[PDB]
Design a protein around this nucleic acid. Structure first.
Ligand SMILES: [Mg+2]
Ligand SMILES: [Mg+2]
Ligand SMILES: [Mg+2]
Ligand SMILES: [Mg+2]
Ligand SMILES: [Mg+2]
Ligand SMILES: [Mg+2]
Ligand SMILES: [Mg+2]
Ligand SMILES: [Mg+2]
Ligand SMILES: [Mg+2]
Ligand SMILES: [Mg+2]
Ligand SMILES: [Mg+2]
Ligand SMILES: [Mg+2]
Ligand SMILES: [Mg+2]
Ligand SMILES: [Mg+2]
Ligand SMILES: [Mg+2]
Ligand SMILES: [Mg+2]
Ligand SMILES: [Mg+2]
Ligand SMILES: [Mg+2]
Ligand SMILES: [Mg+2]
Ligand SMILES: [Mg+2]
Ligand SMILES: [Mg+2]
Ligand SMILES: [Mg+2]
Ligand SMILES: [Mg+2]
Ligand SMILES: [Mg+2]
Ligand SMILES: [Mg+2]
Ligand SMILES: [Mg+2]
Ligand SMILES: [Mg+2]
Ligand SMILES: [Mg+2]
Ligand SMILES: [Mg+2]
Ligand SMILES: [Mg+2]
Ligand SMILES: [Mg+2]
Ligand SMILES: [Mg+2]
Ligand SMILES: [Mg+2]
Ligand SMILES: [Mg+2]
Ligand SMILES: [Mg+2]
Ligand SMILES: [Mg+2]
Ligand SMILES: [Mg+2]
Ligand SMILES: [Mg+2]
Ligand SMILES: [Mg+2]
Ligand SMILES: [Mg+2]
Ligand SMILES: [Mg+2]
Ligand SMILES: [Mg+2]
Ligand SMILES: [Mg+2]
Ligand SMILES: [Mg+2]
Ligand SMILES: [Mg+2]
Lengths: 294, 159, 171, 207, 21
RNA sequence: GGUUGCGGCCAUAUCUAGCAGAAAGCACCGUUCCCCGUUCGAUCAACCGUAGUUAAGCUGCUAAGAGCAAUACCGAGUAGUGUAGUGGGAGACCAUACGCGAAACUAUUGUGCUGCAAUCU
RNA sequence: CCUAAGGGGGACUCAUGGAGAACAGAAAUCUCCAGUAGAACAAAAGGGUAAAAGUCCCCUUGAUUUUGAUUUUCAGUGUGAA
RNA sequence: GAGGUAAAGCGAAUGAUUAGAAGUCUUGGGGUUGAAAUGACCUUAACUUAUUCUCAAACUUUAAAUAUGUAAGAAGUCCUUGUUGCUUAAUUGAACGUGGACAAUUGAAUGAAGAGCUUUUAGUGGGCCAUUUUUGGUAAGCAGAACUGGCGAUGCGGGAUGA
């Protein structure tokens, strides 16, 4: 039997537009977003963490019926301003993006002097504690989307950065890199190693004395900047400081105006044929079919 | 053997709409219900907790209590020769704001607007609603519309 | 352009199946043969249901299979094509561009023979695919492959004839 | 054995068909609904004559079989087995029940089958040639005696078993909008794949 | 060890339909 | 206007087959020391952005396309139905009066719109 | 009837069809594609359910404690259940 | 707002069901052309495709009429800022409020021998009939339900006569 009948198409119920795209887990989305009905219009704030092939996107979002509204957003491509120009998808780049978004959100809110965070990153597990006789810390819930929960995943780098930046984000340390599952304690030394790019630096050192050709191809950008492993840590250590000095968002200066961009894109992309045009097409195809009348 | 269970006779009432089964669109969970809101009740068959009884499917009431995932609604039910106040705990999946408020709440504003502007012009305006009245006189032009005479048609079989 | 670099055919995976009809020592020895050939721990398949004629029952460990990818898959594939003397049939290629054959003795592949192990026949299947099959296998944003990029019987047959200098019969 | 037909004439009960709820149901006496030269083409038999019910009524399967046999016998005897195509247009899907202590536990058992027909519903249709009109009419008029109630013999305005009038059929035929399908025809559609539509109707004069 | 799949849901001995001539 | 992240309504958004896609983005793509998961680094994890590609994803256009959506001197004021009679008819049923009123069918049009943030020839 | 067939989390997708692989055949196991649920969810049926409520994996005991309000049956009493 | 009954539908799902037509490499068989070839053929039967006749209390995309829930203000709408141990990242909200504004067309029709409230007690707890809807039954001055109106409990004019 032919399966794909017209009745099959008639009775098919298409899923949600963004579920058929495979982008939103609506089970997890419902559990995250729904707010206690007795807290009425007070919103729950989400830390959306998304990884592209080249970029890390971290946004603080509250949801409404007309659509989500962004509070602040920090991207990984903002990092070159702070001194990290290469490896924009490290675990440490994730940490830097989390710290940046935390500082930027707190600047927007006004909680800068209060809730500085963990200023001396030693890799210990810590949660942003509320200040007595003061406003509660900005509460944010982690939204990892479709990305799998694994101990060592890069999303928890943004987690730790946001936690160290002063935001209150509830979490546990059994998914951080450096968690010993057999002896249920966190090796904070290894976590601190991962926070400041220690694994990448150790890879640089191990590859340079073993495969110099591969070290030359994999770590090109590092070679022309004459940046070795021993000053890798400094690249993050300064950047952290810079992130805390001026976490404000500076938009990129646009080489063209909005109208010029719109006109340029509007020049391409085909536009739909008029009804008369396709009627003429049908008439021509009918006439040109008369040549296989046999 | 007689059968009278809680969800007896709800085969079609509690069905999801055709081509609308599955996940709940999230506007249901983002709406905010306050005590005094008027809400329609429609049981969603896919959420069985906090589900209304089949009597309240299709009834409209007042929210009196708001909880984590549910609202308390006051319904007046006929029991013999009087009404009994019923207090039903319903999850917000079975509830939607009633559209009867928005019609009456707009007429209050419109009446208020009409009252102020006639007052601005130093004149009067009448705000009471009226039923549809019989139509007035009118003149039918026949230029291009001279009456065409019709007759009843003869009987035919078309099978 | 049909002559694009990313349209290059190449092996996705090779799956090795030994369906010994019983459970116990013989299936274990077939698994030993598979672990010898591939260097990877194979996985045993249980019968989905019971058939008395075949002497199998539901959840009885019947078959064993293993998946190999990369250079080792290529080495095993040509080692098995030598036993087939590089001659498959047209009937052997599926419409989705995958192909398979079955050897009858596992010592023809080129491994040491042990009287304790004995000889087991073996089933070979190669799964073909171009670059970009990750679209159909990734978690997020899963989609389908375009028609020109799809693998079919003809493209796989021509690629097999070119890359192995073998003959594809049709008896 | 069989009760008199007067016991089951009227649609007093809801429809009671064979189903998973009544299973020990006998078969209807009528099994064949198409007779005569049923492989004849549409163009061979232009004239259609109906036997129409003027009653909201039940006709037993036994009565349907008897009328079918009578009409077929007469028309093949008078005009030949290849001069007509007879079709019974009502199928008996309603199960009658019989009861026979007393009225306790009186739900009956299946007893027979009947077709529930409405007013104006066609019972029998006969497609034939024009010259065989007077024969076919008399074939149906005899069959009327096997049925209860009032039935009318009505000459159709349409060509054979088609839904088109005898003039619209000629128009759609000379316009290449009709093709044969064995005993029936297929009509051209101005919707869907243009190439498949054109392939199926080569003689279509487009305007 | 290795095996643990059967993402199906089977009945009893269910030699499936098939089983005919 | 294009693109991405997060969305609202949840097919005018889906399905099939073709064709096209500037910039950026996205994607495929390269690698396995490290966190991590597998029979299989295929999925998941990590690293590089370095060697390559728009072939595919994605986007747009095409189709007397299927489906879907909308409209109606379409069908049809039909079927049905509230109310009435000391209406017709042996009956089955039917007509009429004051009201309400479909579905199929047919024809035509259309094939996502849009919110927050970021980015771009 | 069930220490899971309860609870939480995670991964996967079921019935079925097509095309292929030694013995292997209508039915053993493997692979790709298709697959709106046509399966499965203890049980009778209905409803409900697809990144799940189904299959599989990991951890568990919320199948716990104190007593009120409420829904159904209703006399707006009880019991059961929620 | 809710509904899923009438009608309608089956070249829409499910289930039932009549007929041809064209196709395919498990064609299911009979006779071939066969030496076998299964390699074709004549045939019948299956399926597939586009069609066709007829159906459903325990089928259904659609979907009435009657009937049904809520609303049509002063206990309303709007403005400002007080209380709390609840809530928010908050100076956010929630609820209840102080103070201020909106005057008789104070926010549809129609009616209202006015509205509201309490206590106490009788009889009763065999029912039946008519229209319409309707179940069992061949049916019954039979048995059983739904809404209303009646008889019982009711005389009076008519139906000769009659709950
Ligand atoms: Mg999840
Ligand atoms: Mg019952
Ligand atoms: Mg419903
Ligand atoms: Mg429960
Ligand atoms: Mg009856
Ligand atoms: Mg009985
Ligand atoms: Mg008669
Ligand atoms: Mg580009
Ligand atoms: Mg890889
Ligand atoms: Mg990955
Ligand atoms: Mg492209
Ligand atoms: Mg169309
Ligand atoms: Mg009379
Ligand atoms: Mg009327
Ligand atoms: Mg319909
Ligand atoms: Mg569980
Ligand atoms: Mg889960
Ligand atoms: Mg698939
Ligand atoms: Mg039981
Ligand atoms: Mg369960
Ligand atoms: Mg207990
Ligand atoms: Mg218990
Ligand atoms: Mg009670
Ligand atoms: Mg109780
Ligand atoms: Mg309605
Ligand atoms: Mg019902
Ligand atoms: Mg009906
Ligand atoms: Mg059917
Ligand atoms: Mg009908
Ligand atoms: Mg409609
Ligand atoms: Mg209050
Ligand atoms: Mg009075
Ligand atoms: Mg008393
Ligand atoms: Mg008493
Ligand atoms: Mg008493
Ligand atoms: Mg008594
Ligand atoms: Mg009666
Ligand atoms: Mg009675
Ligand atoms: Mg009696
Ligand atoms: Mg009624
Ligand atoms: Mg009366
Ligand atoms: Mg009285
Ligand atoms: Mg009286
Ligand atoms: Mg008298
Ligand atoms: Mg008399």
């Amino acid at each position: 039997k032919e399966f794909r009948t017209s009745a099959y198409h008639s009775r098919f119920q298409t899923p949600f537009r963004r579920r058929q795209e495979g982008k939103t887990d609506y089970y997890q989305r419902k559990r995250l977003v729904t707010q206690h009905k007795a807290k009425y219009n007070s919103p729950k704030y989400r830390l959306v963490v998304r990884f592209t092939n080249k970029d890390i996107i971290a946004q603080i979002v509250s949801a409404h019926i007309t659509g989500d509204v962004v509070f602040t957003a920090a991207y990984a491509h903002e990092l070159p301003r702070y001194g990290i120009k290469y490896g924009l998808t490290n675990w440490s780049a994730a940490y830097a993006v989390g710290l940046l978004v935390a500082r930027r959100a707190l600047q927007k809110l006004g909680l800068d002097e209060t809730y500085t965070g963990v200023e001396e990153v030693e890799g210990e597990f810590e949660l942003t504690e509320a200040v007595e006789d003061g406003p509660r810390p900005f509460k944010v819930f982690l939204d990892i989307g479709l990305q799998r929960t694994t101990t060592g995943a890069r999303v928890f780098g943004v987690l730790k950065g946001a936690s160290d930046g002063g935001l209150y984000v509830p979490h546990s340390p059994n998914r951080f890199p450096g968690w010993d599952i057999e002896a249920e304690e966190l090796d904070a030394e290894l976590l601190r190693k991962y926070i400041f790019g220690g694994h990448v630096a150790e890879y640089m050192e191990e590859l340079l004395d073993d495969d110099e050709e591969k070290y030359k191809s994999i770590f090109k950008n590092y070679i022309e900047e004459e940046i070795e492993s021993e000053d890798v840590e400094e690249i993050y250590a300064n950047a952290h400081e810079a992130i805390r000095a001026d976490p404000s968002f500076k938009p990129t200066e646009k080489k063209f105006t909005k109208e010029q961009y719109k006109a340029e894109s509007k020049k391409y992309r085909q536009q739909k044929l008029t009804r008369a045009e396709r009627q003429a097409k049908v008439a021509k195809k009918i006439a040109e079919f008369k040549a296989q009348q046999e | 053997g007689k059968s009278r269970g809680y969800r007896s006779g709800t085969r079609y009432a509690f069905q999801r709409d055709f081509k609308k089964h599955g996940a709940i669109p999230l506007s249901t969970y983002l709406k905010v219900y306050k005590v005094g809101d008027i809400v329609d009740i429609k049981a969603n068959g896919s959420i069985q907790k906090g589900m209304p009884h089949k009597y309240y499917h299709g009834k409209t009431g007042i929210v009196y209590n708001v909880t984590k995932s549910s609202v308390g609604v006051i319904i007046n039910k006929v029991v013999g020769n009087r009404y009994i106040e019923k207090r039903v705990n319903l999850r917000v999946e079975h509830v939607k704001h009633s559209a009867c408020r928005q019609e009456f709440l707009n007429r209050v504003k419109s009446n208020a607007a009409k009252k102020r502007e006639a007052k601005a012009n130093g004149e009067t305006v009448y705000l009471k609603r009226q039923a549809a009245k019989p139509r007035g006189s009118r003149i039918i032009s026949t230029e291009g519309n001279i009456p065409q005479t019709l007759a009843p048609v003869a009987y035919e079989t078309f099978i | 352009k049909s002559q694009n670099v990313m349209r290059e055919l190449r092996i996705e995976k090779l799956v090795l199946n030994i369906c010994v009809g019983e459970s116990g020592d013989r299936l274990t020895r077939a698994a030993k043969v598979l672990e010898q050939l591939s260097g990877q721990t194979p996985v045993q398949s249980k019968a989905r249901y019971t058939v008395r004629t075949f002497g199998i029952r539901r959840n009885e460990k019947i078959a064993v299979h293993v998946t190999v990818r990369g250079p080792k898959a290529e080495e095993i594939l040509e080692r098995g094509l030598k036993v087939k003397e590089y001659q498959l049939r047209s009937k052997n290629f599926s419409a989705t561009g995958n192909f398979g054959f079955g050897i009858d003795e596992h010592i023809d592949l080129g491994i040491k023979y042990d009287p304790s192990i004995g000889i087991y026949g073996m089933d070979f299947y190669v799964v073909m695919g171009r670059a970009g099959a990750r679209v159909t296998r990734r978690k997020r944003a899963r989609s389908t492959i375009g028609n020109s990029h799809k693998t079919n019987k003809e493209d796989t047959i021509q690629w097999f004839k070119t890359r192995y200098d073998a003959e594809v019969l049709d008896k | 054995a069989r009760r008199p037909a007067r016991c089951y004439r009227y649609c007093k009960n809801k429809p009671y068909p064979k189903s998973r709820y009544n299973r020990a149901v006998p078969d209807a006496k009528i099994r064949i609904y198409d007779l005569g030269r049923k492989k004849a083409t549409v163009d061979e038999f232009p004239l259609c004559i109906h036997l129409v019910s003027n009653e909201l009524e039940q006709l037993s399967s036994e009565a349907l079989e008897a009328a079918r046999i009578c009409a077929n016998k007469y028309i093949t005897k008078v005009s030949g087995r290849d001069s007509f195509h007879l079709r019974v247009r009502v199928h008996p899907f309603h199960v009658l029940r019989i009861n026979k202590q007393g009225m306790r536990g009186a739900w009956g058992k299946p007893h027979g089958l009947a077709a529930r027909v409405s007013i104006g519903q066609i019972i029998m249709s006969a497609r034939t040639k024009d010259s065989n009109k007077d024969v076919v009419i008399e074939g149906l008029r005899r069959a009327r005696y096997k049925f209860p109630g009032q039935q009318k013999i009505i000459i159709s305005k349409k060509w054979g078993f088609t839904p088109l009038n005898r003039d619209e059929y000629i128009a759609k035929k000379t316009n290449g909008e009709v093709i044969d399908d064995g005993a029936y025809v297929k009509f051209l559609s101005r919707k869907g794949n243009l190439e498949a539509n054109l392939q199926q109707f080569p003689n279509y004069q487009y305007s | 060890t290795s095996s643990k799949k059967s993402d199906a849901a089977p009945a009893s001995a269910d030699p499936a339909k098939a089983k005919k001539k």
